[PDB]
Design a binder for this molecule. Sequence first.
Ligand SMILES: CC(=O)N1CCN(c2cccc(-c3cc(-c4ccnn4C4CCOCC4)c4c(N)ncnn34)c2)CC1
Length: 887
Amino acid sequence: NREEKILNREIGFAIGMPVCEFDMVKDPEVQDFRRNILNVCKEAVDLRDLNSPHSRAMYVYPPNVESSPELPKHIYNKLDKGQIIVVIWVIVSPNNDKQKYTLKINHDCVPEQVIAEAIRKKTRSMGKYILKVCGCDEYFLEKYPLSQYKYIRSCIMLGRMPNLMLMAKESLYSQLPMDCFTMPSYSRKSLWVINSALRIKILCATYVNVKIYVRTGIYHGGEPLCDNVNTQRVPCSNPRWNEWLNYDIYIPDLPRAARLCLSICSVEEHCPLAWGNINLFDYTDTLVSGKMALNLWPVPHGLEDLLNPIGVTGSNPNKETPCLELEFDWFSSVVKFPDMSVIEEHANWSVSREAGFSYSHAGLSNRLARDNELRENDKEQLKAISTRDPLSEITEQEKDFLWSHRHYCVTIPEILPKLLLSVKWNSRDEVAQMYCLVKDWPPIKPEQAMELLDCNYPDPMVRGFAVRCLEKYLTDDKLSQYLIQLVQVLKYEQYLDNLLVRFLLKKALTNQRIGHFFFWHLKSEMHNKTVSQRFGLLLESYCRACGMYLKHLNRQVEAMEKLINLTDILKQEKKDETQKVQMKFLVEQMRRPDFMDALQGFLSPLNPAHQLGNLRLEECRIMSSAKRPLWLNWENPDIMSELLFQNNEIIFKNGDDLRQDMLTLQIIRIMENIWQNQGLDLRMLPYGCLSIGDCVGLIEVVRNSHTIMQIQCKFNSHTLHQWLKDKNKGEIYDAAIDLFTRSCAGYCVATFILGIGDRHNSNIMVKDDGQLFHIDFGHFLDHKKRERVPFVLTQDFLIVISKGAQECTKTREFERFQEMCYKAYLAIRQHANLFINLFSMMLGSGMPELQSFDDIAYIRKTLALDKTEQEALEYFMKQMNDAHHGG
Ligand SMILES: CC(=O)N1CCN(c2cccc(-c3cc(-c4ccnn4C4CCOCC4)c4c(N)ncnn34)c2)CC1
């Protein structure tokens, strides 16, 4: 069709690859994913056309609301007896004359009441409307209490006056095109009865351009199901074997997520050359048989073991790589994994069998359950085990213990991860019973459920339960917050079509705020040939059904492409020139017709609520930094821009990997949020940062900020205190000292916990109002490979806290500061599992300082998790005492 070819061109531009390349893939899993995923697209469209135009408007402008209507105690204390002053703006006559109406209303007033009160005040000056945030495209389209909107909750917590704009419903509705989605043209046995041991034949290898052998292993996630089996040491000039390998496992005992993990190794001096993993079952539940070829992957930097089970599963798309040929066993017919009915029957047969076991029969195994023998000691031991962090070692005795008491475990549902790690995944009698307990398992918090999606949990039944917990209890706010982790754990799915991908895609196509960041996280990794087919196909499905937003995403993609091209020219053809010569070249290139239009009139990828109007060339700069970052400035075309910011500014940087910074910034926001609900107000600055491609992204501009260096220059340790004292003269002096010490306490604790790169005067920034914050988070955890203190409070910082006192280490102000630090540290300690899990979910991402569970072990040290709460406080204090050489 003409409309189809036009749409296919648009999708190609968005993903950065032509749709016709997907058509060419002869792999029934790829073509089935394309067809089958389309029902998620249909479902999402139906939900968006349910209550038109309002439900279309709710998709485009979802309420940016907090997870709970309940406001914290210290926040309410900022309100005039639970009441808020809000300003409502009405544009009257086509002259664009702005009229304001100041209202004093209850914090929990619904937008409809707020509107009625604004029209009363407008009428006293003598339902067909919606409220909009002044200066940006944020709307209050739903019946939430006003204080539940993040914008209002923020204005309350910052002692800022909210500015809302009354707008006719039909003015917004008319600006929402009806997007009628079209279905693309591509939309149109045996079982457990295999009485045999596992044997896989390794035939030969091609493209082996260097004696050598092939190492093999049967894995369930990163765990061996039997002993590893090596081939003979044949010479590399003739890599042939035709040798069958025998495994210590019965074919009916292979779990659903079992994989063959292999590598070509070179011999006392063992070293892996190329590696590759294969699923023993395909996406149809079929056990793989006969001849098959696998293109291997390059050994990653710092890979000690001969195998890579935690590595990507599938053939390398690059076919000019070592290609191992192998052959799997063939039986009577095609073998399939048994269905739930067969599994449920087997578990019930096993359960009933065990229930009739004599005292002495149960005595034969420590894994054997003893009915009505569960004492309160056993019950307390189980509770103690369940409160341990996810990285705590579960001993073999504890594993036998947990499994024998799996029926009591149902009563403490948060023990599910520990109990799942205690199962003998190579025992079908155990796994069948694990399934039936998972099928009826009480639901757990989405934060506990997220862990079950990491690399330690490959089983589909387990991942399905976790997805079900996200579907019932994960709010759109929390989904937005953990989207990066959720997108990463997709790479851990055995197959293209799964329940996690279906849930994410449904939410992306049902909420444009989610859809926006979902698109960008996927797109940013499209250069990675390990994920580009998975992420490309998911992008294609998203682009066919997101509606009008594809056209807006294309404006964003083109703008970024131009900025990448421009900065690639400045770095490779203007690198040695002066800033003046580079600026002249830049302003002449951005003025060109092949650039001017592509760089203005689009939505900010950092926050699509921000419209980027005309580019203000005279305000744009090439920043002094090494990677020649662009400080870009555009006019905000909003009618009421003057109430937020008249010019939207962003930093574009081409050269640095921004992925560790996004993770740290995300963790800073989560820490601040925990502290804020806990009652202790330590203001943090998790500025926006979005990786849009390979070492390329955006950084949010922080207005009225200066490095510690800039201050100390325009010496003495009282310079910083005097600068702040001068910037905040009069009664406002104390509010600035309180904000400095509070933000300072937050960063001391956050940076100590996370092991961030060493702090200096050009790494630390201060706002005019006293808010201190850190920049450049490219280094974290055990990156110095014994625990560091990256943020050392010098005399300058302590002199500010102690209000200019000489003996700042011995003041009331410093004792108050220390208490903020201990309270902050103990609050994070209480939420350790969350942080541990956020980090564990990012292990598959190629982050250089997050490669294994030993890198995450660093926060187990900084949070003194094996210790008691008081010994942990004493530990933190010693770390602070040692670094500062004082106390
Ligand atoms: C007005 C103007 O154009 N100016 C004055 C302010 N200048 C200035 C001076 C010192 C620091 C800065 C500076 C550095 C950073 C920052 C935070 C995280 N990363 N980075 C940058 C990103 C690019 O690569 C380097 C690190 C930021 C920021 N977010 N907002 C405002 N200023 N700012 C900015 C830059 C030039």
